[PDB]
């Protein structure tokens, strides 16, 4: 059958980590996404992963709309599909973070969705639990998405060009998981690295990240 998200894939009994095909809501356009079926009860649709810096994230507005990368590794699932899903029903957002010394942390948001394209894919987040900080490193109320061409941020600057990525940037706010990747002994003092302020401060660049969504019914 078609499946809209990895939680349906899981309930059909495909309880194994892998790439699966998902269908746009009320349509026949297909997308391929990684499903995490073993962490936290499974059913997690990965929407972003960073691991090794093999993939550039300085992409245009159209690429962030469609998606880019490889679902086997570092990739962005695409704002359009995520906007179509998260406006159909309540999704949670879990963010998983690793540093170079070997620590783990996460943030959980009990409601996430994206506005439509005419509202520049603005983020909405509600609730916050977990260990990667007790204040949301994504600014609230959520900002418009911004990219090296689409300057929708509150800075008089171009945040996407100073911080080299596509993000809901503010001016320019406490986080950017789509920033530059810095390897094993260059990750400190990097203002444009993979940033999550309320866990490792500014200038520290993270080792790995994963953003993933699941229905709050699950």
């Amino acid at each position: 059958i078609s499946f809209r998200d990895c939680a349906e894939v899981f309930k059909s009994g495909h309880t194994t980590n892998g790439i699966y095909t998902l269908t746009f809501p009320n349509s026949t356009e297909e997308i391929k996404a990684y499903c995490d079926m073993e962490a936290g009860g499974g059913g997690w649709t990965i929407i972003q992963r960073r691991e090794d810096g093999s993939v550039d994230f300085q992409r245009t507005w159209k690429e962030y709309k469609v998606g880019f990368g490889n679902p086997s590794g570092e990739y962005w699932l695409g704002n359009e599909f995520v906007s179509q899903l998260t406006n159909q029903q309540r999704y949670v957002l879990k963010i998983h973070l690793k540093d170079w010394e070997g620590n783990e942390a996460y943030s959980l948001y009990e409601h996430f969705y994206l506005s439509s394209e005419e509202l520049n894919y603005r983020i909405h987040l509600k609730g916050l639990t977990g260990t990667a900080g007790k204040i949301s490193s994504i600014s609230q109320p959520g900002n418009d998405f911004s990219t090296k061409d689409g300057d929708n941020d509150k800075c008089i600057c171009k945040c996407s060009q100073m911080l080299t990525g596509g993000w809901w940037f503010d001016a320019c706010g406490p986080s950017n998981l789509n920033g530059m990747y810095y390897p094993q002994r260059q990750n400190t003092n990097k203002f444009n690295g993979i940033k999550w302020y309320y866990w490792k401060g500014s200038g520290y660049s993270l080792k790995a990240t994963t953003m993933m969504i699941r229905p709050a019914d699950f």
Partner: antibody, heavy 120, light 109 residues
Framework: EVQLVESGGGCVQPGGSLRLSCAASGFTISDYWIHWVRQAPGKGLEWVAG????????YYADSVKGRFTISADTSKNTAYLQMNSLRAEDTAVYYC?????????????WGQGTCVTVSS | DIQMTQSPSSLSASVGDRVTITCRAS???????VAWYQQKCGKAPKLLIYGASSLYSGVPSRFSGSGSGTDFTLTISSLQCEDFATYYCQQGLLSPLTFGQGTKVEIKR
């Protein structure tokens, strides 16, 4: 060398009007922001306005918004501040400054300043 | 608007002493956007430090800065008679571009 040279300050009546001119030398203003900063007698620095000449975007402090108007004239590499409905509070030294919007991200060069005295 | 509050409005210290100026923002500021300026009697200001902590060219290495988020600091590691000036923080990020109130350094002799 890089210079900014502002000119056209003076004495003017309250309610009067005046036009400061900041001439830039050694750089093309289109590649940087031009900002005006003022210092009232004995007071701190107040930021007045700024312009992006490659785009015409303009910004104003609340104190002057809708009274002053910053503009730029790339064919003369020059920036202007038209001042209208002047008041005693507008008495200050006015400096134009180059703002570098790439990595130094600061006002690295400043003009010498020009005096405006608003007094009957 | 973003309010920039400098905690000592003036300080007086002897030649050799170490002094620090603390500037506090009301909102998270990206540290690349914070700068410090020095002004001396009847002069235009000059840039000392950019990006919260980077020393500008030709500034004496006794100046240094640090901070992130809301809290930023300017240090003179050993005060010299020529450091008599007023020092201003600024945020260059969200319009309008507020300066701090300034801090005056007086030198004991």
């Amino acid at each position: 060398e890089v210079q900014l040279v502002e000119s056209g300050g003076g004495c003017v009546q309250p309610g009067g009007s005046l036009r400061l001119s900041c001439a830039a030398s050694g750089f093309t203003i289109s590649d940087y922001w031009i900002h005006w900063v003022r210092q009232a007698p004995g007071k701190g620095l107040e930021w007045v306005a700024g312009i992006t000449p490659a785009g015409g975007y303009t910004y104003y402090a609340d104190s002057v918004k809708g009274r002053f108007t910053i503009s730029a004239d790339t064919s003369k590499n020059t920036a202007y501040l038209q001042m209208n409905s002047l008041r005693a509070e507008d008495t200050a030294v006015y400096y134009c400054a180059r703002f570098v919007f790439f990595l130094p991200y600061a006002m690295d060069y400043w003009g010498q300043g020009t005096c405006v005295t608003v007094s009957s | 608007d973003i309010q920039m509050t400098q905690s000592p409005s003036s300080l007086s210290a002897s030649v050799g002493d170490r002094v620090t100026i603390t500037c506090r923002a009301s909102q998270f500021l990206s540290s690349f956007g914070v700068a410090w300026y020095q002004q001396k009697c009847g002069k235009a200001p000059k840039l000392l430090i950019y990006g919260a902590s980077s020393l500008y060219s030709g500034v004496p290495s006794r100046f240094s800065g640090s901070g992130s988020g809301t809290d930023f600091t300017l240090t003179i590691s050993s005060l010299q008679c020529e450091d008599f000036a007023t020092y201003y923080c600024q945020q260059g990020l969200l319009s309008p571009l507020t300066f701090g109130q300034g801090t005056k350094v007086e030198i004991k002799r």
